[PDB]
């Protein structure tokens, strides 16, 4: 009864603390002796070199699961995709903890990727809830020309159509254009006054500047913005009244990995008595056969549900993504993020803090605006 766990982390202190967490999880009652083994590796700067090294070290060490987090440089993309494909060749379940990008959601590409961090697309599920409390019916969407943006748009459209409702319009823009003034100008000639933005940080800053120069930040407008489009340089150009989303302890890698190691240990314990067990391939070289128990391990991981983690309950969606995540709805006051509302799933609960709106208005505006200029 020997099961090894691979780790692809950023800093050595995290490696030591997660090794300590694995040592704690070794006994945890029930388990016997040395059923768990801990292995770790750093983030190799080159993607091809990283993909080679993860197979040369982790796969060669008989890892049942691989733990991978965000790179130590958040500004750089540095996606863990190279480590997802290789372990996906042998159906090895990789576990992401801080990769919020909505590319791994489609499991046709990443066959054995599971993440406990909700993606940006799930943020769309929050937005409809924001429409319920404030009675938003007419609304417009801005989406960057990216797979993540398209997935978020599809999720929002499906959730709105579930209530037999349609948004006013959706504007698609390429990730990097500067002359976005035409899109905002043509969006101004609409009844809806609330815009949902889904783009990159630079695109968010460009849209903020365009709105500022086109007097679109006045009273009446509502700006519902996600996590990626408020942080960083966006705060340089974000006007007051932004209703931004944030992930509670989403950037906290330590808590996410401490919950993930326990979830993986519980899944291994459940799997070691389910049915016939086939060992994972010893090495990447000289083995072109997929792991027979890989899909079963993935199903066990997706079916697992434990609230013992410090981040609250842990539940996986039908596609293997985080479900019922704690979101924080912040209202930008004096360019300062203030926690205004909480979202523990299903419903969103506000607090006693009053919500300000763009243009200095302290009263909730109305999305409907009868222009009376009927062409």
């Amino acid at each position, epitope marked *: 009864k020997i099961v090894n766990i691979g780790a692809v982390l950023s800093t050595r202190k995290h490696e030591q*603390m997660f*090794r*300590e*967490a694995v*040592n*704690q999880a*070794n*006994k*945890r*009652h029930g388990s*016997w*002796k040395i059923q768990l083994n801990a292995t770790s590796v750093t983030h190799k700067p080159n993607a091809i070199q990283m993909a080679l090294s993860v197979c040369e070290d982790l796969i060669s060490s008989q890892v049942y699961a691989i733990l991978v987090s965000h790179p130590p440089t958040p500004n750089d993309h540095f996606t863990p995709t190279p480590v997802s494909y290789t372990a996906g060749f042998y159906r090895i379940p990789v576990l992401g903890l801080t990769t919020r990008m909505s590319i791994y959601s489609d499991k046709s590409i990443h066959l054995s990727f599971l993440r406990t961090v909700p993606p940006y697309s799930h943020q769309s599920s929050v937005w409809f809830e924001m429409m319920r409390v404030y009675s938003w019916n007419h609304i417009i969407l801005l989406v960057s020309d990216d797979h993540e943006g398209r997935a978020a748009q599809k999720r929002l459209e499906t959730l709105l159509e579930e209530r037999e409702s349609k948004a006013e319009k959706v504007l698609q823009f390429d990730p990097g254009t500067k002359n976005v003034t035409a899109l905002l100008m043509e969006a101004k000639e609409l009844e809806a006054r609330v815009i949902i933005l889904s783009a990159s940080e630079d695109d968010a800053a460009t849209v903020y500047r365009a709105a500022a120069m086109l007097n679109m930040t006045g009273s009446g407008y509502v700006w519902l913005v996600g996590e990626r489009e408020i942080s960083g340089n966006a705060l340089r150009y974000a006007p007051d009244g932004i209703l931004g989303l944030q992930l509670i302890n989403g950037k906290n890698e330590s808590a996410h990995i*401490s919950d993930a190691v326990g979830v993986v240990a519980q899944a291994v314990h459940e799997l070691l008595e389910k049915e016939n067990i086939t060992d994972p391939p010893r090495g990447c070289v000289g083995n072109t056969n997929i792991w027979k128990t890989g899909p079963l391990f993935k199903r066990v991981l997706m079916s697992s549900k434990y609230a013992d983690g*410090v981040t609250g309950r842990v539940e996986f969606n039908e596609d293997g993504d985080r479900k019922f995540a704690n979101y924080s709805i912040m209202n930008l006051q004096n360019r300062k993020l203030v926690q205004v509302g909480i979202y523990n799933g299903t419903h969103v609960i506000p607090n006693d803090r009053k919500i300000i709106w763009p243009g200095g208005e302290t009263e909730k505006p109305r999305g409907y605006q009868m222009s009376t200029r009927l062409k």
Partner: antibody
Framework: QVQLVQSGAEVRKPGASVKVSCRAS????????VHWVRQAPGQGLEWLGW????????DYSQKFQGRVTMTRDTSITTAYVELSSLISDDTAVYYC??????????????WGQGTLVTVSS | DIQMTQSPSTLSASVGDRVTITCRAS??????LAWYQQRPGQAPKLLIYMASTLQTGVPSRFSGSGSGTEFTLTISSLQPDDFATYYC???????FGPGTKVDIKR
């Protein structure tokens, strides 16, 4: 030298809640697991559970799951165990012990004096 | 869970008499057994770890041996401090044995 100071003996009525504190000194509190173990009079040792102050994770025995709670205070380096729904069988002597972090071969190197909890009418 | 059986349960011997304690587990536990000595009104004291190496500072009279499921503790000359209960515990299961104590013959 590892020093552990426990509270005095307590008498509680059945159905109430009891809290026992154990102050640790002379060693790195965060770098060692704190284990709670109870012993009935004239009976074998009954392992309650353990807690790691560094991470805050707690492990409880299956018998006491759902009623036992373990907390740690790093500011004063003190462990606390709270037990609810007390029964007559809970009358026992509780001990806090130290365990090395990352080592699974040195169980309970040091033992405390112990605190007696009596549940009777 | 691993069940520990100790023989004899209570040995009514005298001072200096050879004391042999045999502890058997339900299943194979390799060598993950710990021998502790406990006195009435006092906390147990560790004597042997890993079922083969005595704790540092323990008297040389104690001798621990065995493997698999069967382990043995031998005392050549029992002293006044040796009149105490002995427990064999499995670390991987945290299961303690019934306890072998030396009683005064009457």
């Amino acid at each position: 030298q590892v020093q552990l100071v426990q509270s005095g003996a307590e008498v509680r009525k059945p159905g109430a809640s009891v809290k026992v504190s154990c102050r640790a000194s002379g060693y790195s509190f965060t770098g060692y697991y704190v284990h709670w173990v109870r012993q009935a009079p004239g009976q074998g040792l009954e392992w309650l559970g353990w807690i790691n102050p560094n991470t805050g994770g707690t492990d409880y025995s299956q018998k006491f799951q759902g009623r036992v709670t373990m907390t740690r205070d790093t500011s004063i380096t003190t462990a606390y165990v709270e037990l609810s729904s007390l029964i007559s069988d809970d009358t026992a002597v509780y001990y806090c012990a130290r365990d090395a972090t990352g080592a699974a071969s040195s169980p309970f190197d040091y033992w405390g004096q112990g605190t007696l909890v009596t549940v009777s009418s | 869970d691993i069940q520990m059986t100790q023989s004899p349960s209570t040995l009514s011997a005298s001072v200096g008499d050879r004391v042999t304690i045999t502890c058997r587990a339900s299943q194979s536990i390799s060598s993950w057994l710990a021998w502790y000595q406990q006195r009435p009104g006092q906390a147990p004291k560790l004597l042997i770890y890993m079922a083969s190496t005595l704790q540092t500072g323990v008297p040389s009279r104690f001798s621990g041996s065995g493997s698999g499921t069967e382990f043995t503790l031998t005392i050549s000359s029992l002293q006044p401090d040796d009149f105490a209960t002995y427990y064999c515990q499995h670390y991987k299961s945290y299961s303690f044995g019934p306890g072998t104590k030396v009683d005064i013959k009457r």
